[PDB]
Design a protein around this ligand. Structure first.
Ligand SMILES: [Mg+2]
Length: 324
């Protein structure tokens, strides 16, 4: 209404503004150079911010969609996620913009150029939790608990704001230079939960999930979904971290969605040598029925206690190769 008059003003130009503008503009895209930049270090020139003209590229995502970039005026280096326009979802920015949490990769701005949405964000120097698991087969339990713990703090943030990530997994967790900090990214599968708590459903075409192996049973059953899907995924992530491979992967080859539906939870993939409280945390996080599944916050507590049970975090950042 007033947002309509507003967006028309924002269109056709790249400006330095706030998150609300970006969000509003974003909705436009989800339905020629324009956008909003949320940091001083990324500076438009004369209403424009074009690739190879104002900023240059220097690929690491599921789609090789993410690059190191540099602003040609300012010298500042960050990351660009290229997303095609016809596929773009405002929830990528909605579940991201102005979210002041150290567990969520900060958004630096987003700029449309032609059929491309260029999403700018902090470049975290230590890469993805996924790459870390690849490099060193699997992670020590305490290290595994540590990162799950930090991902849960980030999800607790999202959920309390009525936001569901949609695709929680090691590849979508990023790490600082020392590996001390972990923060969520890729909100491409994020959904905004409407006033009535739980929402959408995969079959209606609103919650399109990201990674099959990490997908909760209520998703596959075409049931209504809430934040609880993230909690299931985060434990699939936990299994990935502990075993050096996704759930279901080592056992079933074909349409997993049908297996996830009717099998017991991947609970059998829990390493026998794990601390009982770690096993319990995963077990509670992998309850097939969402209502009885613990919340991110509830799991955070159990995870926190389990880390203490294993003598705290005393594993080196990078050292041992631990065979899958
Ligand atoms: Mg990704």
């Amino acid at each position: 209404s007033v947002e309509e008059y507003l967006v028309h003003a924002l269109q056709g130009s790249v400006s330095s503004g706030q998150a609300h503008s970006l969000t509003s503009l974003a909705k436009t895209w989800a339905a020629d150079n324009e956008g909003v930049l949320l940091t001083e270090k990324l500076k438009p020139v004369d209403y424009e911010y074009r690739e190879e003209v104002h900023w240059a590229t220097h690929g690491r995502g599921s789609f090789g969609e993410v690059h190191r970039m540099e602003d040609k005026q300012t010298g500042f280096q960050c990351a660009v996620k290229k997303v095609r326009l016809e596929v773009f979802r405002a929830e990528e920015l909605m579940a991201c913009a102005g979210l002041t949490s150290p567990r969520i990769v900060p958004l630096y701005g987003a700029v449309r150029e032609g059929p491309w949405v260029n999403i700018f964000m902090e470049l975290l120097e230590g890469g993805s939790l996924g790459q870390l698991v690849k490099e060193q087969g699997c992670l020590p339990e305490d290290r595994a608990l540590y990162y799950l713990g930090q991902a849960l703090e980030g999800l607790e943030y999202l959920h309390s704001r009525r936001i569901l990530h949609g695709d929680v997994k090691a590849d979508n967790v990023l790490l600082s230079s020392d590996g001390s900090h972990a923060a969520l990214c890729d909100f491409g599968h994020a959904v905004c939960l409407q006033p009535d708590g739980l929402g959408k459903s995969l079959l209606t075409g609103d919650y399109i999930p990201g990674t099959e192996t990490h997908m909760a049973p209520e998703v596959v059953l075409g049931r209504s979904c809430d934040a609880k899907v993230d909690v299931w995924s985060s434990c699939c992530m936990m299994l990935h971290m502990l075993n050096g491979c996704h759930p279901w992967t080592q056992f079933f080859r074909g349409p997993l969605c049908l297996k996830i539906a009717s099998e017991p939870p991947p609970v059998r993939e829990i390493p026998p040598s794990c601390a009982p409280l770690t096993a319990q945390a995963i077990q509670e996080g992998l309850r097939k029925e969402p209502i009885h599944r613990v919340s991110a916050a509830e799991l955070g507590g159990k995870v926190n206690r389990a880390l203490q049970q294993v003598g705290g975090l005393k594993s080196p950042w990078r050292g041992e190769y631990k065979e899958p």
